[PDB]
Write a structure and sequence with these properties.
It catalyses: a beta-lactam + H2O = a substituted beta-amino acid. Its EC number is 3.5.2.6. Belongs to the class-A beta-lactamase family. Keywords: Antibiotic resistance, Disulfide bond, Hydrolase, Membrane, Plasmid, Signal, Transmembrane, Transmembrane helix. It is an enzyme of class 3 (hydrolase). Helices cover 37% and strands 19% of the residues. The protein is of the alpha+beta class. β7 and β8 form a beta hairpin. The longest helix has 15 residues. The chain is globular and about 55 Å long. The protein has a single domain, classed as Beta-lactamase (3-Layer(aba) Sandwich). The strands form three sheets. A five-stranded antiparallel β-sheet has the order 2-1-9-8-7, with helices on both faces. A two-stranded antiparallel ribbon has the order 3-6. The protein has a two-stranded antiparallel ribbon with strand order 4-5. The chain starts with a helix and ends with a helix. It binds ligand A1H1U and chloride ion (2 copies). The site of one chloride ion (CL) has 2 residues, from loops.
Length: 263
């Protein structure tokens, strides 16, 4: 069964033409399915989870933080800001920016989360404090998505991100209020229907965060509640050889189906 899954993932990777990274943690039996799980991949917008979590951690000692008002200026706009562009010259709260970053992948929102915890090195130090040595957020939006092969900036490994996502969503990295808030935000994601969700039965409940970037980089990280089962954590990262390659969300869906068949 395990050899079969490995063969199927290798065949999927070969067909895709790119480089595939998978880590599944099954909390029913504390098992894992790993494929290139210690290699680095550009996170792209999947890094928005760590930034939102760092804001939530800060809020544990700062009860006015989520309500804090943040001005949205023309000079804050970057390349993709579906929510923030509606609020130029007004303010949004940090809770609203967290939701926009997580549920729409809004880049202004991500930059405000980064800024309000101290910058990329502070988001990285938060990961370190959780026991994640691998995660590195080097840059802000939009440059963190370049995803150049061989470039370690703005990368993590599938294993590291799966273990950290377990801690954030199912474990004790965050206090109960803050963990529940992260889970609710991720369950409300609007961007993930073509990725991991597309490879799972319709009845399963998912909280996920997608990402895309240069070199056809196509990513998704998820917490999954299968029908009447203990939850799963799944990271699917994918990147391609050509600078202008198009996204391959089908590859993420295929990987999700391969690693969950039988559950
Ligand atoms: B970030 O990688 O996530 C979205 C795309 C997605 O949801 O997969 C996006 C869009 C534009 C810039 C950065 C990102
Ligand atoms: Cl951890
Ligand atoms: Cl179905």
């Amino acid at each position: 069964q395990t050899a079969d899954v490995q063969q199927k993932l290798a065949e999927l990777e070969r067909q895709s033409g790119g480089r595939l990274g998978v880590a599944l943690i099954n909390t029913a039996d504390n098992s894992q399915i790993l494929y290139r799980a210690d290699e680095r991949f550009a996170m792209c917008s999947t890094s928005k989870v760590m930034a939102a979590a760092a804001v939530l951690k800060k809020s544990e000692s700062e009860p006015n933080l989520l309500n804090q008002r943040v001005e949205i200026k023309k000079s804050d706009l970057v390349n993709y800001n579906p929510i923030a562009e509606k609020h130029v010259n007004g303010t949004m709260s940090l809770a609203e920016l967290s939701a926009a970053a997580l549920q729409y992948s809004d880049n202004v929102a991500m930059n405000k989360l980064i800024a309000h915890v101290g910058g990329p090195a502070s988001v990285t130090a938060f990961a370190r404090q959780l026991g994640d040595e691998t995660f590195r957020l080097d840059r802000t939006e939009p440059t963190l998505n370049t995803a150049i092969p061989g470039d370690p900036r703005d990368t993590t490994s599938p294993r590291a991100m799966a273990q950290t996502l377990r801690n954030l969503t199912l474990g004790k990295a965050l206090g109960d209020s803050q963990r529940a808030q992260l889970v609710t935000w991720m369950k409300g994601n609007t961007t993930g229907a073509a990725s991991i969700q597309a490879g799972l039965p319709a009845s399963w409940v998912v909280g996920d965060k997608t990402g895309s970037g240069g070199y056809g980089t196509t990513n998704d990280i998820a917490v999954i509640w299968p029908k009447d089962r203990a939850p799963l954590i799944l990271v699917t990262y994918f990147t391609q050889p050509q600078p202008k390659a198009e996204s391959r969300r089908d590859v993420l869906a295929s990987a999700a189906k391969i690693v969950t068949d039988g559950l």
